Enzyme design. Sequence first.
Site, PDB file in Angstrom:
ATOM      1  N   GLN A  59       0.906  -0.856  -0.435  1.00  0.00           N
ATOM      2  CA  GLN A  59       0.285   0.094   0.075  1.00  0.00           C
ATOM      3  C   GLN A  59       1.242   0.987   0.635  1.00  0.00           C
ATOM      4  OE1 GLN A  59      -3.156   0.381  -0.273  1.00  0.00           O
ATOM      5  NE2 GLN A  59      -2.888   2.387  -0.523  1.00  0.00           N
ATOM      6  N   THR A 113      -2.286   4.230  -6.193  1.00  0.00           N
ATOM      7  CA  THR A 113      -1.807   3.601  -5.580  1.00  0.00           C
ATOM      8  C   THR A 113      -1.419   1.947  -6.119  1.00  0.00           C
ATOM      9  OG1 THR A 113      -2.111   4.364  -3.346  1.00  0.00           O
ATOM     10  CG2 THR A 113      -1.098   1.702  -3.408  1.00  0.00           C
ATOM     11  N   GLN A 114      -0.047   2.030  -6.256  1.00  0.00           N
ATOM     12  CA  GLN A 114      -0.066   0.968  -7.395  1.00  0.00           C
ATOM     13  C   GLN A 114       1.307   0.014  -6.378  1.00  0.00           C
ATOM     14  OE1 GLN A 114       1.444   3.977  -7.791  1.00  0.00           O
ATOM     15  NE2 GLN A 114       1.295   4.836  -9.986  1.00  0.00           N
ATOM     16  N   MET A 173      -3.102  10.183  -4.446  1.00  0.00           N
ATOM     17  CA  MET A 173      -2.841   9.021  -4.033  1.00  0.00           C
ATOM     18  C   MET A 173      -2.605   8.311  -5.403  1.00  0.00           C
ATOM     19  SD  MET A 173      -3.297   8.927  -1.074  1.00  0.00           S
ATOM     20  CE  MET A 173      -3.159   7.179  -0.297  1.00  0.00           C
TER      21      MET A 173
END
Lengths: 240, 204, 235, 211, 244, 231, 222, 195, 233
Positions: free
Chosen positions: G1, I1-2, I107
């Site tokens: 994450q 997010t990745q 993000m």
Amino acid sequence: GYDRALSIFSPDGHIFQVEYALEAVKRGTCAVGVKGKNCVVLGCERRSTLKLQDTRITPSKVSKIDSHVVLSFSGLNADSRILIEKARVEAQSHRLTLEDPVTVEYLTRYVAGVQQRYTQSGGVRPFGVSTLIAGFDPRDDEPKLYQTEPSGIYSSWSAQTIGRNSKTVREFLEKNYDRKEPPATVEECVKLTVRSLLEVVQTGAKNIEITVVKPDSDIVALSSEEINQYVTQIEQEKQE
Amino acid sequence: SDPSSINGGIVVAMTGKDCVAIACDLRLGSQSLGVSNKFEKIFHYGHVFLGITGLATDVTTLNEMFRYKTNLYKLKEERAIEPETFTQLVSSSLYERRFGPYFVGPVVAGINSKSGKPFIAGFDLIGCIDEAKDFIVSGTASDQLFGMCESLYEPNLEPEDLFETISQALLNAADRDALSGWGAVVYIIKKDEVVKRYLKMRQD
Amino acid sequence: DRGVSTFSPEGRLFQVEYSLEAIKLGSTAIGIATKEGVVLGVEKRATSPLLESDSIEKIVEIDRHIGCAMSGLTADARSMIEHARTAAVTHNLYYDEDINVESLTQSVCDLALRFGELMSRPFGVALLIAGHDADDGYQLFHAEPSGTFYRYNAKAIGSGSEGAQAELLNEWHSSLTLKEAELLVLKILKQVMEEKLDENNAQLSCITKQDGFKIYDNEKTAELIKELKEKEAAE
Amino acid sequence: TTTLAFKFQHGVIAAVDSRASAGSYISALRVNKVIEINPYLLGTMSGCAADCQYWETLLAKECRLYYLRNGERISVSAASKLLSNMMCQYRGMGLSMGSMICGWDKKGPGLYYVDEHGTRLSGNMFSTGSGNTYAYGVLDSNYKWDLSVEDALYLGKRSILAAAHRDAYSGGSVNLYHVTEDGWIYHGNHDVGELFWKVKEEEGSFNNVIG
Amino acid sequence: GSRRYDSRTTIFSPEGRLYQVEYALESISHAGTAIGIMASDGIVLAAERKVTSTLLEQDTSTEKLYKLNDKIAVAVAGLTADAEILINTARIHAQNYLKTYNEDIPVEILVRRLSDIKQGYTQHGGLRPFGVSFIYAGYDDRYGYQLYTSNPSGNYTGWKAISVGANTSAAQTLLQMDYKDDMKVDDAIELALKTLSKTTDSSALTYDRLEFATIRKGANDGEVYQKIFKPQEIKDILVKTGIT
Amino acid sequence: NNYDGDTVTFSPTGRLFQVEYALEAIKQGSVTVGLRSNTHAVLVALKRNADELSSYQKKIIKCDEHMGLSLAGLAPDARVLSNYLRQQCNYSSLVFNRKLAVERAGHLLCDKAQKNTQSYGGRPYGVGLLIIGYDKSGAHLLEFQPSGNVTELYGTAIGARSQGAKTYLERTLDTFIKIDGNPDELIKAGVEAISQSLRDESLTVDNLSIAIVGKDTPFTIYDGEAVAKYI
Amino acid sequence: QFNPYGDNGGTILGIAGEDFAVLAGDTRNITDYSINSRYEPKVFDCGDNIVMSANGFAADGDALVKRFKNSVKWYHFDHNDKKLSINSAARNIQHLLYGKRFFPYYVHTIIAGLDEDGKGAVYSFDPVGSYEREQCRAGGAAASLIMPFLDNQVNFKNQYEPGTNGKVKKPLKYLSVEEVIKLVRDSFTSATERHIQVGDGLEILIVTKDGVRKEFYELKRD
Amino acid sequence: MDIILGIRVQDSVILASSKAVTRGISVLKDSDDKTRQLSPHTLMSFAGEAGDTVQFAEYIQANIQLYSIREDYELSPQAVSSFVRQELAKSIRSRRPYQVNVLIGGYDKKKNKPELYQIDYLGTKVELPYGAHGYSGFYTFSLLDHHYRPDMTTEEGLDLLKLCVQELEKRMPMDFKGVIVKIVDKDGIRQVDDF
Amino acid sequence: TQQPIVTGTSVISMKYDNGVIIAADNLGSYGSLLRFNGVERLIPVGDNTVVGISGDISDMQHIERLLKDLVTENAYDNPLADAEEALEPSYIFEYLATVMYQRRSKMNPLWNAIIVAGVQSNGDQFLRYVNLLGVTYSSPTLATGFGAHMANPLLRKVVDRESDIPKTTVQVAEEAIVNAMRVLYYRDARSSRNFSLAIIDKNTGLTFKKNLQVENMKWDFAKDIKGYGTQKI
Ligand SMILES: [Mg+2]
Ligand SMILES: [Mg+2]
């Protein structure tokens, strides 16, 4: 969306759409407002061109905005419903957010603002309506009477009339209404309001409506017979 | 937690000779607490009858929704909606909430006014139609009802014989379910008369 | 017809020029700036004797240190005043200070040319914005529907403006007291008004550093009118 | 934190502690937990300092705009409601606020508790923060409507001291306010260290503590 | 640009009238006459179809009288297509109210709603108004039997008896002459047909040129029944009242 | 005539009358002069008052530390365009850590004005601008017209009677371009240039407005007694 | 994450004098156990005699300082080159911080300068914008090591006058700029000894009526 | 804001609601009135999550007061309850539902009948002779099932209500600080000031 | 997010008297799989700047396209695009830093660590770091990933503070960089022998060296190492 500027200035500095909206008010049935020492009376003309009318269900000319404030008008009937609805919504919205009912002045200022907005917004025409707004502020015994018009200007009046032949009844009120001593009782205030309409109305039958508003949310509409007794007494004194 | 068993309740429908029957219990509860013994789960729009089990708020909402829609149908079509058509309307209406569904188990019962053919149908919460010839079951005692109906049912029962069969199917199923009971109603439906009967049963 | 944002062959916006004609029909408003304060005065001009004149509100508070007088289609001024009050209070919220008079005026004037086919027409009202701040002292501004604002030592707007402005040209000097300014506004208002000037058909106001913006009582103004009458009879 | 406010004969007293902590570390010995919304309205502050500061500083904006429009000073009831409605906009979002809106209007002295949930309670006495239980004890046993301004000021002061002593996350100093119909009056900053010894001797209380 | 072609449908005349509303009323004055009469024990709706043909399928035809719900019906005068747009909206409003409050919508509330929709087209949007006048016949438990009318302006009023469409001046005079307050439905039926028979522009009043409806508490016990008359039933009432 | 009702209409000879009318507003405006050398660039502006009680309308606006302009015509339009320049200068500094080239600033103003000349509903800007600045390629002077046309010049003037100042600068070209490292003499040449456009009135202490930018000189405006030195 | 936040260490210190103010910070920048830079300036002159430092997550710190510097520039444009007072700057920063209440700038901000009476001023902010004027504030990694020392040596807490035995406090006499700088240097030298993230260098910005002055001092590099 | 009871007798509806409000481990108030008058002859009591209860109640109040003014008419208790149910059914599938349970006690002036409606936060409506929310019913319903008659007087209803509260006070772990009791009948709404 | 998929390891760099040096290996790893052996991770921008990128390769190729587009855009309506108004290292860095911080703030980061090396117009050395979080810092030596832990200690022995920069020649600087790359090849499991090296000098301009190899390796001592404790054979 339709954005066309309908209300615009002319070379002489006039907004014709707003001025033509006043002509619609001139066509409307006469409305009158008179404030006594401890009350306000709203009188309204009913044109007798329409009989076979069901008076139980026909939209009455005086409308309660809240339990302590009323609104009457002259001009386009359909237009007035939109202003009345908005006013009623704002009244409840005020009670909800501020926990006090609206003052008469505040309610007037709101309705007048709606009318003004419709004179410089695109794609809309002005309201063809002038209003008389009357009542008593919460926990106050001073009578309140205001007037609004299509342009959005508003002001307080000791006594005022709007609609057709309002020039004549204003003439009557200006010579008959004394500021130093306003109608001390409900009787005197109603009598002066009926007298003012009798200058213009025609027959004193079902053509005159009277609504009395007293302090502390005491609002009542007079019946045909009650008004008829005022009509009778006025002319019997006149035969002299 | 499970929305389809918070309030409890059951509905069963059956076909007979030139007739249909639909029945339901009267319980509404908050899990273990019994709240109402007068919560009827069968409604009707003209001659078409709809039973609904499951989450009670959705039962009420859907009844109001189908009253709404069948009233507009009638004004436009100039005739009462038929069971076959209404079944499709229920299915369509449930599937439109595919990813946020009403937590219900509806059951349609009625007789087509033109053909005279008895009709019943059942649905899952998202609209899949079960058009059985014999019987349809729904609610927190559906397993019990399947057991009762599968053994008690026989085809072409006369209206007054069908009444006894469907009543005993409901009652004994409800008496093996904690969340069903507290009274019961049975509708016996013929082409132009409908009789409604409240049953006497144990109140625990 | 023709566009609302159209230029004339002379290089002027038709609608802006026409709104200026509406302002010429408005009641007179006068402002005089001194080193002791800025005075604002208006002609009420009631259309009937039954109209309660104290409900005529043509002088308005924007903040404690800024006042405002209006002339023309006065209904149009309400949204301008609302914006001004919001701008003044919002700046105090963001910066924990009073807003400059010029900055307030500039914020009001930014609304002016936001019309087209935004609002459907320019405002039909002119404003005299008077106030005080620590950087530039006592100030008086004239805000127009063109979006332009000029600072003035003294200014008159409305129907009797050019006659009043000529009078202000002769009377104003850099050493005027507050009392002298008050009498001067009353004098020039009395000159251009149709009806006879009294405490009920004319209103005074001022802004000082100490006491802030104040609208004058009818009793207070009545005394200044009586003081004016006597000093004019004194020669 | 410990904040309190109570109604009495000649107005409302507002008393708060002055400590801020980041875990066991005392980040501040002297934060101001009363906001002077305006000269007639006060707000206490518990929960998130930023939420209290931002939303009540904004409340003052709204109360000033109210007075400019209507010409009258806003009521304590209306002011408290404007604040509670701002909270309901960010409901479920994590705002953290618990304060007493204190003032004097037409109905007399007024006191409303407002929190992040939108709760809006009118009352005679309120206390919030990690040391509110200790302050309530002193308040409940000594509170009368018949209190003098002098005795009421001491009561609110003594009640914060009780909390400051026992609650680990309350202390530093005590800030007093007295709200009248002519406006609030500040009654100083009082160091708890010095106040404790002073009160111990004069009053005879805190016998268990050696001095 | 586009401004060039704008008729400006929502503007006042110098006299303070709404051009398009006035012209829409002119259109409606050429439509077939519709009449409503309110009695103590019910309401009558009578209306004339416009110059028909022998090949028109009358028994499946509807151009004048429409059902809004079980308690409320309307008679139409003007553009039929415009009317159906409004009628469907009114039907939805009635069901919205019923779903919300679990009570049938009071007559006036439905009337006010439709009249407000008409009003909007005269004040904003730049669109032409609906060229329709309605007569509303309905019942609720507050005011009982009620008649209303609305026109393209969005103004509505209540009536004991009223006409819309062609020859309303002549029709209203005839109604004003013979109407009495203690009148009953069967008498009102006769008055309506007699008035149409005298005001019609056709040579004679026949069943194929009429639409007829009644709202009666002549439904078994305390409830109300709507009766949209069939062609044969209109033919019978014409013989009964002595017109054919 | 029949083709001047809006900006979206060409005349039969291919003219845009609304744009030409906007150009006319500049001619009514008060005179302002711009000129530069190789080290500095100067703006000189004659401010206009309403009457003797009024202030003199400001003409010069700062856009960044290294750039600013003077206006002639509708002042609110100058505020809109200068606000846009302030933002663009600022975007260049924040994103690229780069001072906005004066030539690029001119290209941006051109394009912004152009969009108002080809679309329905809008109007052209009613103001002319003289932009001065000092960037990585030295001193610059630009003239902006609300037609969209932006031009880089050694010197120029816009407003009423601007032709007199423009002819003077055309004569003085070879002299004032060589005034390097002497700010006062460059301003003198600008004050002498704007004087060729005066009639009846002369340059007073609250009448004159001057701005300068250069090699080691941030954009600064001089008003009041700060310009008495040059009167 | 993905974690949008980080910790760049660093320690800052603001002290308000009678007619001056200092804002000091170490010049070391770190992630985990590694040194990114031994000299990465952390305290900035923002114009109008205001100095600022946003300590914690350096990306958010740089973003906030950049936006505040921008706010000073536009305050000049919008309000006729008026000087932004320290109290006005403080309130403005609150709104910058609270604007991201639900996705905060992960920094502890301190500004320093002079108030409108010419007296020394320091303001202290939390990540979501709660602020206050203070006399003495340390921020960041070694804040807990420094503040107790300042309570004792600046405000004379727990110090009483000899002979009285607790009855008379040590009087709060005013400190000169030379005296404050001594306490700043000793604070950071002591922090450097006991905190691994503190070291390399110390940069101090001093604000007086004459303007902003800088002083640099070496710290231990281990 | 946990305990709310209702009982419909011969000629009136009686609502009893607890006075306590708790924030954390402290009881903030012991005189809280968990009720709103929707119209002269309709009263609504409420219980659920903090904040939502009053906000929902006041929102309903505003809407009914708006309707009353528009039509110059008081909606029947049944109509009001249906409006309220729809608002909660609407709310349960919203982004953030209003966690509010209500009792609606009204006197129908047309039918001359008292009416009690129980509605939970899901929009589950039932008309009952007596009702409650949460666990309140667990303690009180056995007493109500035993003693309740439909021909009870207002005074008998109050006595049965006292017995219910006494049982709550005995077997409930929480101190709810007594109840405020209000009566809804043909003459309107009044509060029993000694209970 | 990745999550990063195909990745590049350390980028290392330092300042010297007349300019900057930057280096990075030619590997594109797929977890522990050494998948792609011909990946160029130093990307020149003009003749004054080299941008060295580690981390996600798909994001590197995206950044490479942004920089290519930046050069195109700068040349538009710019007569001095190859002179006074050419792209500076500082302009290129500030742009990338803006993009990196904006992307982390949504993000959705560009999963990279970047070092911008170059020489400014006035001859000043430019060397600054930026990563997926938008964190920026400058130092006489800069390195990403493993390089931060192993290269910086070696490079800091040459230039320990600012005053060491004028005392450091290009020969000494390059020698230190090349040695650091060898050390990383010994000790980083996601490194390769092949690498690129770029020198940006204020006098001799940009020198870009491809296909360099780690040489002079010590492995002979391995023959004597037997067992893990007690084993002799
Ligand atoms: Mg049981
Ligand atoms: Mg260390």
